[PDB]
Design a protein around this nucleic acid. Structure first.
Lengths: 244, 505, 255
DNA sequence: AAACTATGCATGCTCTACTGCTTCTGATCTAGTCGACT
DNA sequence: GACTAGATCAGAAGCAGTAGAGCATGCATAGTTT
């Protein structure tokens, strides 16, 4: 299916766009059902959830006598569900706004986040939107830039900051959007340097052997008929063995 | 870094600390209280497992484990909480200042050796392993023992003993009418003395501004997700640890409390036959899948065995040019692979040689990845990473391998057919002008998660009983006002060039 | 002494003279059930401060917020006192409907009479508004006094007698304000006693006061001829005698 | 032609298991002090 | 001898991250009725 929205650079410009999920991890939809060992029937199995206090007597409490709360460090503060819904961050749903434009070098793959990649095309059967999107894509490609944008599927979806970059092919052209990490999602881990290390300095013979191994195990062949790199082991086209 | 963090706040309670030079300027005691509260909040949010203590010296009343005179230990080393924050805030206001004077007193003789001794005793009373032992001295006085030299020598000896033990001390000098001279007496007490911090200070310490800067983000210590095995061959083997340099941030899980008494409630689950009414175990159950009219029954162990191909770890397959790794072929966040050397010796040299050779040849190592048992294998690419450090020798990109998951055929979806429509040079130029107008520099930490920040603020308001929760400004908004003011007439020209008059987008 | 018999009570009082634990202990010992959070069974929540929790409860119109003073008074008399708008910070729709019939929209009642303190609190509840006008407000005040026979007040004696004073050399000209000594004080006192003083001589002027300056008597006598209603020129002794005797003297003796 | 209903899907939320890493705690070996004995 | 100390090493609790299952709910689009 297509996700329709409006790419807005400011408060006036707006381009009708449709986003599809280009890449998304595939999972089995059928779920294993627990049944009784003897009768092989689901009816003879029941799962019940009960709540009790931290006491030997094991006092029983109704499900309607439980309040949500949160730990604040050495203590727990109640936080009712209605209170949380009232005080939770609220924003307009289905927003695709271009926060800004940045050099493609400033955005690195290693910082990519999320579990999906979106492909954004112009609105179907819309000449003006297609022309505007093509102009934007060509300008970004020529300037070697990407668009840092704000994305939200709907009202409930949490706002996300992502990067959209051009993707131009002779068959079609579009934008590729991938989520970017927040300042809270980055881990600052320090690792000891390996280039300046003296205890783990390889010798010349070891480097030569590693070079020979790398050359021998190359998975790409340089076809001289067109002077192009052909992949002998393309793992992207292989199906997932788990399903089979 | 293994252990916890211990922080003790020493707040001087002399008369000079309770006077304000100019109007509209909070007294140094109140400033110290606010700094302590901010540190408490930052510790509660980032890492609540640390220990914080608050000790006052120079007060009339005394409360110490040894019964030293003129020293009060308001809060012993313990995990931070809302109760301690409220207790500190009780002295925040002028009425709180009066309460502190009445219940604590001020204007009494004291010895720095005594406060250092009680601080050391407090440190020695913690049963947990402390990675860092730190003390902060909030005092605007620079020559406390100006009328006695024996006390100065005792304080010097105590400071030397604390430094030898491993205690790291700071002096958060505050505003003074005349001026603060660190070189006078405190120079020999600070663990580390900076050459710049030698002249007389006529203003507040720069550390105070940093301390007051509240930070709202969970800090996680370095930890390897898995110490897996890389097998170039069935005989050649090395050990490598996997880390997640980037990880999604989730709010703390909610907890169920009893409404009547507000206490934790234990949650339990059970399964029993509707006929026999007896407890059942996972080993006394079968998994069923219905396809149309047929039913297929498999044991739990069989279902687990279904997704079993190879043992956990990384198995090398070959090397591929980096040009073949598409940027848009992203499925999951990338991981970091670094040699361990704690399991198999000699792996570090092999890893370094492979890294440098791959960097020279610009080839990524293709491998089969099995993070855990009973997990289907995946295809991953290890791209070598060059150790990158910015100015002043601060690392920004560690050396190792970047593991990127290569999507399978099923993970890819086919897009609907579309007809290409090239844009004329004029429209492309107008878009170039707009983009150049909206130029901006991007950094990894230029944005904050509004949901998490709002949740933290709401929790703070609930815990501290504040009137309202301070609204957290979100930088994820496009601030259309500035963009419109900057673009000018470019948008109208672009619309005229592209959008027909009878369009109404 | 279980006046409170199996009643759920939620206390959320913070910055107040009596802290939470004392109120909780008193409620527990007074045969009352104390709960940290409100539920469907709770019928009122005590709140002495407008904290975040109290505001959230107010926004969710499903509970009643009561000031701690209500519980203190209940303890004082050792009995269950009926609710009043004074103690209620919030009113649920059921309680709002209940109070609407018995009590006025403000903190005033329809059946039980009002006293000095109660009327003071009622006036405190109503906040000042600016939908009135000086002229219409004065007219309404005069009508109210006339309807209920309130013309015997000492400070409202000049309510229905507007007075124009010759404090300007040129009539109907504000730029010619005079520096008179007795005249300014007399005008100030007359306006203090409820009289209406207008800087512009309009058709509504009914009385005129002129001091020792007799030069302008002819001008006033000429002006009053054109006026449909002729005003009266009175000496400064009339007002002084009226204040001294605390009642309106006849102007015929000072014309 | 327009209004109401139907399916369909996506994403965030909750729970329960699963595995692996880190820290705390309980069981097991010796120096010193007092005492017993020949 | 006995004991208490001291140290010291092996098992259990907590945490973090992942997968699999079931649902809230709202936003889109296809079909039926007036």
């Amino acid at each position: 299916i297509h996700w329709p929205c409006r790419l807005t650079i400011g408060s006036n410009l707006s381009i009708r766009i449709a986003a599809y999920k280009s890449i998304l991890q595939e999972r089995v939809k059928k779920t294993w059902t627990v049944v009784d060992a003897k009768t092989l029937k689901k009816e003879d199995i029941q799962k019940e959830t009960v709540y009790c206090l931290n006491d030997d007597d094991e006092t029983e409490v109704l499900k309607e006598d439980i309040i949500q709360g949160f730990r604040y460090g050495s203590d727990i503060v109640p936080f009712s569900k209605v209170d949380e819904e009232q005080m939770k961050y609220k924003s307009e749903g289905k927003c695709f706004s271009v926060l800004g434009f940045c050099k493609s070098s400033q955005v690195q793959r290693r910082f990519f986040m999320g579990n999906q990649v979106l492909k954004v095309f112009a609105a179907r059967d819309d000449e003006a939107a297609a022309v505007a999107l093509s102009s934007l894509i060509h300008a970004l490609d020529d300037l070697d830039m990407v668009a840092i944008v704000r994305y939200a599927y709907d009202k409930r979806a949490n706002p996300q900051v992502g990067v959209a970059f051009p993707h131009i092919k002779h068959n079609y052209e579009c934008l590729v959007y991938v989520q970017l990490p927040f300042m809270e999602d980055l881990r600052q881990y320090m690792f000891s340097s390996l280039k300046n290390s003296k205890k783990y300095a390889p010798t010349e013979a070891q480097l030569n052997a590693v070079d020979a191994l790398i050359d021998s195990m190359s998975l790409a062949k340089k076809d001289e008929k067109t002077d192009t790199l052909e992949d002998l082991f393309p793992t992207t086209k292989i199906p997932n063995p788990r399903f089979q | 870094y293994s252990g916890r963090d211990s922080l003790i706040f020493l707040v001087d309670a002399s008369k000079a600390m309770f006077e304000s030079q100019s109007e509209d300027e909070l007294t140094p005691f109140d400033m110290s209280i606010q700094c302590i509260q901010s540190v408490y909040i930052s510790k509660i949010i980032s890492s609540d497992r640390d220990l914080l203590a608050v000790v006052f010296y120079g007060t009339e009343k005394d409360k110490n484990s040894v019964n030293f005179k003129n020293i009060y230990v308001l809060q012993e080393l313990d995990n931070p909480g809302a109760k301690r924050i409220l207790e500190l805030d009780q002295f925040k206001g002028q009425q709180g200042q009066k309460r502190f004077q009445d219940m604590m007193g001020h204007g009494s003789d004291y010895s720095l050796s005594e406060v250092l001794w009680v601080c050391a005793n407090l440190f020695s009373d913690v049963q947990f392993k402390m990675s860092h032992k730190r003390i902060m001295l909030f005092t605007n006085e620079d020559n406390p023992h100006g009328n006695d030299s024996a006390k100065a020598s005792r304080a010097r000896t105590k400071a030397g003993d604390l430094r030898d033990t491993g205690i790291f001390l700071d002096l958060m000098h505050l505003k003074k009418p005349g001026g603060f001279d660190i070189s006078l007496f405190y120079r020999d007490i600070i663990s580390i003395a900076e050459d710049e911090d030698l002249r007389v200070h006529f203003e507040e310490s720069s550390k105070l501004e940093d301390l007051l800067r509240k930070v709202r983000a969970k800090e996680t210590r370095k930890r390897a997700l898995s110490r897996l095995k890389l097998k170039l061959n069935k005989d050649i083997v090395i050990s490598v640890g996997i880390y997640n340099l980037v990880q999604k941030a989730l709010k703390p899980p909610p907890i169920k409390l009893y409404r009547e008494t507000n206490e934790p409630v234990k949650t339990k689950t059970r399964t029993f036959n509707t006929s026999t009414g007896g407890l059942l175990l996972p080993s006394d159950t079968k998994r069923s899948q219905i396809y149309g009219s047929r039913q297929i029954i498999l044991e739990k162990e069989e279902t687990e065995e279904l997704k079993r191909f190879d043992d956990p770890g990384l198995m090398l397959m070959g090397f591929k040019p980096l040009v073949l790794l598409k940027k848009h072929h992203y499925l999951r966040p990338s991981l970091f692979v670094y040699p361990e050397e704690s399991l198999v010796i000699g792996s570090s040299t092999l890893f370094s040689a492979l890294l440098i050779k791959c960097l020279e040849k610009e080839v990524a190592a293709l491998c089969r990845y099995t993070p855990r048992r009973n997990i289907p294998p995946y295809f991953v690419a290890l791209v070598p990473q060059e150790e990158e450090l910015d100015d002043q020798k601060i690392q920004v990109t560690p050396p190792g391998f970047q593991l990127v998951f290569l999507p399978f055929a099923d993970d890819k979806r086919k897009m609907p057919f579309t007809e290409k429509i090239m844009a004329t040079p004029e429209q492309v130029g107008k878009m170039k002008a707009i983009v150049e107008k909206l130029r901006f520099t991007y950094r990894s930490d230029s944005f904050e998660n509004p949901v998490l920040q709002q949740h933290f603020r709401n929790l703070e308001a609930l815990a501290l009983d504040l009137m309202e929760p301070e609204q957290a400004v979100d930088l994820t908004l496009p601030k259309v006002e500035a963009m419109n003011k900057r673009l000018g007439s470019l948008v109208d020209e672009f619309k005229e060039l592209v959008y027909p008059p009878d369009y109404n987008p | 002494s279980n006046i409170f018999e199996d009643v759920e009570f939620c206390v959320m009082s913070g910055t107040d003279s009596q802290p939470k634990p004392d109120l909780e202990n008193r409620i527990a010992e007074f045969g009352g059930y104390i709960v940290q959070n409100p539920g469907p069974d709770t019928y009122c929540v005590i709140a002495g401060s407008e904290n975040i929790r109290v505001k959230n409860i107010i926004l969710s119109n499903k509970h009643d917020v009561v000031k701690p003073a209500w519980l203190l008074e209940c303890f004082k008399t050792k009995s269950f006192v009926p609710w009043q708008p004074r103690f209620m910070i919030h009113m649920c729709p059921s309680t709002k409907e209940h109070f609407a019939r018995e009590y006025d929209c403000y903190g005033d009642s329809y059946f039980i009479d009002t006293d000095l303190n109660q009327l003071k609190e009622v006036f405190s509840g109503i906040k000042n508004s600016n939908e009135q006008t000086p002229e219409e407000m004065a007219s309404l005040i005069a009508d109210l006094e006339y309807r209920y026979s309130w013309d015997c007040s000492p400070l409202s004696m000049f309510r229905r007698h507007t007075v124009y004073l010759d404090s300007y050399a040129v009539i109907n000209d504000l730029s010619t304000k005079n520096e008179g000594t007795r005249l300014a004080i007399k005008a100030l006192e007359l306006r203090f006693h409820g009289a209406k003083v207008v800087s512009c001589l309009a058709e509504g002027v009914s009385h005129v006061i002129i001091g020792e300056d007799h030069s302008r008597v002819a001008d006033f006598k000429a002006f009053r001829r054109t006026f449909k209603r002729k005003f009266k020129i009175l000496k400064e002794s009339w007002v002084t005698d009226s204040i001294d005797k605390c009642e309106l003297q006849e102007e015929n003796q000072y014309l």
